[PDB]
């Protein structure tokens, strides 16, 4: 339909993808580093979620260079997405209420 509305949803599908590839890539990068805890897929997915939302509790975090780079991408994707939905809600509210005048 509307650009902003489409870009938002596209941002959401893209998010889910980054979340999954994030889980895969994180484990791939962290495994091999002594003491690393981001080493099994199920928890790595939960790590990805709390990173993308930025709640970073943490209970798990990358410690290798590539794990951190993967973390940086997930952070930005999550922030961009959640930020692309706010702009879509602002476009909807503005354009709309503009009629209520």
């Amino acid at each position, epitope marked *: 339909s509307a650009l902003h509305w489409r870009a938002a949803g596209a941002a959401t599908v893209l998010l889910v993808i980054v979340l999954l590839a994030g889980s895969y890539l994180a484990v791939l990068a962290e495994r*091999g580093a002594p*003491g690393a*805890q981001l*080493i099994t*897929y*199920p928890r790595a997915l939960w790590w990805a979620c709390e990173t993308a939302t930025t709640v970073g509790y943490x209970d798990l975090y990358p410690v290798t260079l590539w794990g951190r780079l993967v973390a940086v991408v997930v952070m930005v994707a999550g922030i961009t997405s959640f930020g692309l939905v706010t702009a879509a809600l602002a476009t909807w509210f503005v354009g709309r209420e503009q009629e209520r005048r």
Partner: antibody
Amino acid sequence: QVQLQQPGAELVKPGASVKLSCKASGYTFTSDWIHWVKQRPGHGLEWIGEIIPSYGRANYNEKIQKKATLTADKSSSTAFMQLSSLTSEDSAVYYCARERGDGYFAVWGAGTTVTVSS
Amino acid sequence: DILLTQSPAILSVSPGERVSFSCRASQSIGTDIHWYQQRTNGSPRLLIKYASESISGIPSRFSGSGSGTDFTLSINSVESEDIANYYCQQSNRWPFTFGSGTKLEI
């Protein structure tokens, strides 16, 4: 159907080299890691290393000399471990096991008995 | 590298009794512990995963408990087929590691 198939035994002369194999069956996912565990007679289990076939990357135990090199062949679904410059010390039973990226070893191979003698 | 300690190394029990093996982690690992069985001339067999979760195809006789650094694998009423070597393994931190082992004797 036996999930992992390994040659029953291998003989190697000191200083020589042998390449063990492990053919897998059943379901196969991108999240599969194949591990190699070494067991000397009368003793316990010793993690040697791991490899992720879908990507081809492997990691090895730092607390021990690196006699092994891991490789994988996607087409024939076989994982190989190249043991080099052996000695009586490298003589034991080598297992391969599969892990679904969740931390435990679901299934093991029968194990390949390796002997280093002249 | 997490050090898993299993003591004692040999456990002797009377038929039908209740036996308990213990694993001691050198640092908190949650419940990221798993147990294996290896009979003579055999290969390891997963018995319990994640400290408590039961595996399919394993007698309801086998159970596990613990969290942090202290874990226990129990057998309610042990029997002959249980004579073997039990090992624990952690997946909390890299690299995975194995316990020294415990032999069950009747």
